[PDB]
């Protein structure tokens, strides 16, 4: 009927980690290669995603217990989940009115047609937009949003992880926090936790479709040369 | 006392290749990550150099006989000479008045202090600027400028080349053209060819110093992650 001190301490750490790694002013975006509307948007979106990967790494390093995993597991979790965390965290810029991601500037407003000009198809972008709208409609508290990103990150059912038992125990404790938070602090949230776990399933499906379409980019050197080294590393197929 | 049709045909091809790969409007530069004046200039200069590598490859493919070399030799020549051709071709933007490289815009004006903010030291930048001023003082005809870039590219005394005899024969014919051009067409150029060959020696020394300083960037992942895949490939140490 009430959250414990340890549960609250987890929430505080995760909220702080998100506020430290998500800059609502979007002022760093002027440093990316500019948007162009031949894959005219691939340079700008590559830079955006590369920047976002660095933020997700910074967020992950502040999740309780992530830092204490082996280096191989930390890499395994980030390589499998990075694209999902980016899709999740981008909801904070998504607008139901514009049906687009809005980042404090008309040049940094991204609609579906922009992403087609980076090598992706409606087979990815239609479920992605439907995901954003459904997730936005849940009206998650920031507490619930950061818990979901952490739960998504600390999934043991990802390729390459060795210490399944350790990661599952971390993810278990985060799920307990989220269920308790919704019950005590989220008025009328009886069906919310189930909906949030459904979104984790949706992300798996978006992850697969993105990986398939990213293989086409990475197999064509005139396109892969537009990516960043960090993107090449994290979305690449190297195994530690 | 007069240039032959084959010598003139070589000059025409090289001038055309340079005009096709060097855009005096510099309008593409707005697509680079912006300049910032922590290595604040490394993103913009990485993009500039990566762009310039693509142009040098395009220029090389139109040098008579380059295209007919083996793929390994074409790569060997480009990996060893790319930085030298870029230093040579950048003279077209260099100003004796400003002591800087000027590209049709104040944001795209590069002085020595800009390059220090990309990880390089005066041990490279002082000889580089002295090279640009001495080369500018030669007042080369565009014919002589493009011949020198081609001669520099088709040097057989570069690591990794296998067909020394083929490349030397190509470079020999280009040297014959340049010597004849200066004698017939360059008033008062008695000492010019010797000075131009000296500049090729200077470039070797700048190449060595740049490679040494580039190793520091490429050994620090927070800096190498700012480079482009093409720069990583061409300036890297992989051997075919």
């Amino acid at each position: 009927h009430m959250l414990s001190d340890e549960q609250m301490q987890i929430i505080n750490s995760l909220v702080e980690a998100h506020h430290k790694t998500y800059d609502d002013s979007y002022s760093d975006f002027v440093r990316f290669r500019p948007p162009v509307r031949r894959l005219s948007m691939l340079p700008h979106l590559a830079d955006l995603v590369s920047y976002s990967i660095q933020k997700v790494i910074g967020f992950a390093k502040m999740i309780p217990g992530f830092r204490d995993l082996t280096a191989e597991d930390q890499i395994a979790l980030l390589k499998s989940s990075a694209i999902e965390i980016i899709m999740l965290r981008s909801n904070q810029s998504f607008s139901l009115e514009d049906m687009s991601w809005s980042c404090g500037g008309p040049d940094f407003k991204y609609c579906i047609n922009d992403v087609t000009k980076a090598g992706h198809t409606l087979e990815l972008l239609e479920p992605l937009v439907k995901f954003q709208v459904g997730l936005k409609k849940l009206k998650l508290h920031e507490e619930e949003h950061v818990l979901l990103m952490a739960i998504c990150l600390l999934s043991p059912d990802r390729p390459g992880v060795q210490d399944h038992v350790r990661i599952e125990a971390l993810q278990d404790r985060l799920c307990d926090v989220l269920q308790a938070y919704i019950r005590i602090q989220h008025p009328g949230g009886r069906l919310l936790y189930a909906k949030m776990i459904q979104k984790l399933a949706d992300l798996r499906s978006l992850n697969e479709e993105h990986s398939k379409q990213y293989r086409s980019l990475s197999f064509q050197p005139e396109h892969s040369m537009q990516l960043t080294p960090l993107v090449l590393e994290v979305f690449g197929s190297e195994v530690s | 006392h007069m240039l032959s049709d084959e010598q003139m045909q070589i000059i025409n091809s090289l001038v055309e290749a340079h005009h096709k790969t060097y855009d005096d409007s510099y309008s593409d530069f707005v697509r680079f990550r912006p300049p910032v004046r922590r290595l604040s200039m490394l993103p913009h200069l990485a993009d500039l150099v990566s762009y310039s590598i693509q142009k040098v490859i395009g220029f090389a493919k139109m040098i008579p006989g380059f295209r007919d070399l083996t793929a390994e030799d074409q790569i060997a020549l480009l990996k060893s000479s790319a930085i030298e051709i870029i230093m040579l071709r950048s003279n077209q933007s260099f100003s004796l008045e400003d002591m800087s490289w000027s590209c049709g815009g104040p944001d795209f004006k590069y002085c020595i202090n800009d390059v220090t903010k990309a990880g390089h030291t005066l041990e490279l930048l002082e000889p580089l600027v002295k090279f640009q001023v001495g080369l500018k003082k030669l007042k080369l005809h565009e014919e002589e400028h493009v011949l020198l870039m081609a001669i520099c590219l088709l040097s057989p005394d570069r690591p990794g080349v296998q067909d020394h005899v083929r490349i030397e024969a190509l470079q020999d014919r280009l040297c014959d053209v340049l010597q004849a051009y200066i004698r017939i067409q360059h008033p008062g150029g008695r000492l010019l060819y010797a000075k131009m060959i000296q500049k090729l020696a200077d470039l070797r020394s700048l190449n060595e110093e740049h490679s040494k300083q580039y190793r520091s960037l490429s050994f620090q992942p927070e800096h190498s992650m700012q480079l482009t895949p093409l720069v990583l490939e061409v300036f890297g140490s992989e051997v075919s």
Partner: peptide, 10 residues
């Protein structure tokens, strides 16, 4: 391999 990731993970 994973040169940059290792660096960023400190």
């Amino acid at each position: 391999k994973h040169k940059i990731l290792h660096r960023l993970l400190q």
